[PDB]
Design a protein around this ligand. Structure first.
Ligand SMILES: COc1cc2nc(C)nc(N[C@H](C)c3cc(N)cc(C(F)(F)F)c3)c2cc1O[C@H]1CCOC1
Length: 469
């Protein structure tokens, strides 16, 4: 007798029937949700007929783009507190008479509807604290509410779920063990002597160590980005937003490093010195490549491709062809929508730092022109399919967040790279305009004579090379 009698929607909001006004499924693609109201999404999230692990994962990764953590907690609590449908007139008559009605439909509602749903709400809670504990770290009150809620749950079966959720919450509160599979190589130094932080610069630190420390820094920044940080947040990447601290830190780093390489190049007006700077940056790229740090490789490429750097024909004329080949092949990684890059990424062995920029590009492509909502019969439905497509892209990022580099952190170098601010107080566009004008100054366009500039560095320009000592 499949369909059951449910409480009315005036006492239980999840009891409203499915219609085109509140839920749409995909066809020619378990029914896959294309769109729906938040109420309908939450109902299907904790659906009585079957388990939906894929929808639970996707919803919990993407829900902040259409619903607040606090609102979500209210809705699942609401979903949990199921009223019983009022007795039928026939059942109520048996009660008048002092009799006990069979209550077949009531027993069945408890069994096939109340228990599967309450259980699925608890599974959602468990998945929530395990994979998205950061929601609770950012909002202490959210965690108070969750703890208070699970503490009111009664029943033996259910109490195993409450125990699991409690266990997780404790493990997450307690929680950085670092495991070297092999013995890390000796830290490399060049002109700047260890601890002499005031002299730290592009040419004074060892090319090898710059590349190792930037790889460690970028590996940590990449590993700290949660999938959910990339959902409904792509056009405000640079803004300090509560759902995206690690996304912001990663992008800031990439921007600062790329603009720093550029600055180091165009602010070195002496040709011989500028050639040494460019050559050193290609050396850092070589070491990035041997470290499988594709994020670093592509940061060097973006810098070498920027309008201020790309036009420096006299600088690049003095670069060894072996170095030019390296940079030329590094550019080819990005051609045909990163075709060669994806081939290398998928063929190399870990520790690696995947190029992060590509995920932002693809998420932007997926979200561009993709409606936030669908409108049916004047009502609004959340476009869940848009959220699902972003989640498929973010799922890829996770697979390369599990191997530590066998490399020793150098605290002073690390701090130097963490504190890079090439822009000063300038905005990016204006700074790049300034860099472009500096490019014109150091290498005037054809009619104009090539001026010769004073040296700004008094230390050897010769590189120690990319081979360990
Ligand atoms: C059709 O566009 C492009 C084709 C390119 N093809 C290749 C083989 N490499 C490129 N760049 C590498 C990173 C490079 C840069 C510099 N500065 C010097 C070298 C070299 F080693 F050769 F000297 C190599 C290219 C950049 C392109 O376009 C960019 C610049 C304008 O806007 C977008």
């Amino acid at each position: 007798e499949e369909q059951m009698r449910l409480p009315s929607a005036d006492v239980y909001r999840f009891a409203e029937p499915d219609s085109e006004e509140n839920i749409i499924f995909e066809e020619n693609m378990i029914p896959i949700i294309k769109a729906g109201t938040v109420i309908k999404l939450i109902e299907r999230l904790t659906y009585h007929m079957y388990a939906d692990p894929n929808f639970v994962r996707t919803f919990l990764t993407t829900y902040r783009s259409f619903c607040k953590p606090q609102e979500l907690l209210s809705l699942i609590i609401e979903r949990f507190e199921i009223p019983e449908p009022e007795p039928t007139e026939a059942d109520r008559i048996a009660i008048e008479n002092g009799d006990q009605p069979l209550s077949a439909e009531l027993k069945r509602f408890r069994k096939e509807y109340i228990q599967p749903v309450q259980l699925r709400v608890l599974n959602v809670c468990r998945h929530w604290v395990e994979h998205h504990f950061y929601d609770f770290e950012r909002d202490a009150y959210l965690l108070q509410r969750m703890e208070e809620f699970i503490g009111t749950v009664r029943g033996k079966a259910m109490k195993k779920w409450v125990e699991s959720i409690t266990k997780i919450i404790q493990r997450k509160k307690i929680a950085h063990n670092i495991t070297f599979q092999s013995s890390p190589p000796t830290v490399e130094w060049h002109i700047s002597r260890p601890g002499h932080i005031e002299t730290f610069d592009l040419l004074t630190l060892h090319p090898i160590e710059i590349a190792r420390q930037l790889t460690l820094l970028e590996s940590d920044l990449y590993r700290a980005v949660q999938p959910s940080e990339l959902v409904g947040s792509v056009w405000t990447k640079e803004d300090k937003e509560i759902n995206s601290p690690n996304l912001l830190k990663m992008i800031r780093h990439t921007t600062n490093l790329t603009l720093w390489f550029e600055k180091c190049i165009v602010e070195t007006e002496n040709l011989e010195e500028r050639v040494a700077v460019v050559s050193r940056i290609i050396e850092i790229l070589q070491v990035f490549q041997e470290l499988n740090n594709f994020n670093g490789v592509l940061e060097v490429v973006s810098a070498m491709n920027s309008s201020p750097v790309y036009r420096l024909d006299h600088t690049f004329e003095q670069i060894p062809s072996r170095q030019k080949k390296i940079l030329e092949e590094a550019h080819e990684l990005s051609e045909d929508h990163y075709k060669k890059y994806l081939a290398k990424l998928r063929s190399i062995n870990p520790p690696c730092v995947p190029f992060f920029g590509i995920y932002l590009t693809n998420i932007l492509k997926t979200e561009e022109g993709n409606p936030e909502v669908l409108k049916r019969h004047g009502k609004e439905l959340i476009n869940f399919s848009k959220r699902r497509k972003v989640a498929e892209i973010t799922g890829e990022i996770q697979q390369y967040q599990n191997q530590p580099y066998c490399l020793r952190v150098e605290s002073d170098i690390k701090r130097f790279f963490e504190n890079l601010n090439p822009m000063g107080n300038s905005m990016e566009k204006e700074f790049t305009d300034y860099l472009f004008n500096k490019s014109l100054e150091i290498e005037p366009r054809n009619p104009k004579p090539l001026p010769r500039f004073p040296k700004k560095y008094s230390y050897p320009l010769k590189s120690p090379g990319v081979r360990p000592s």
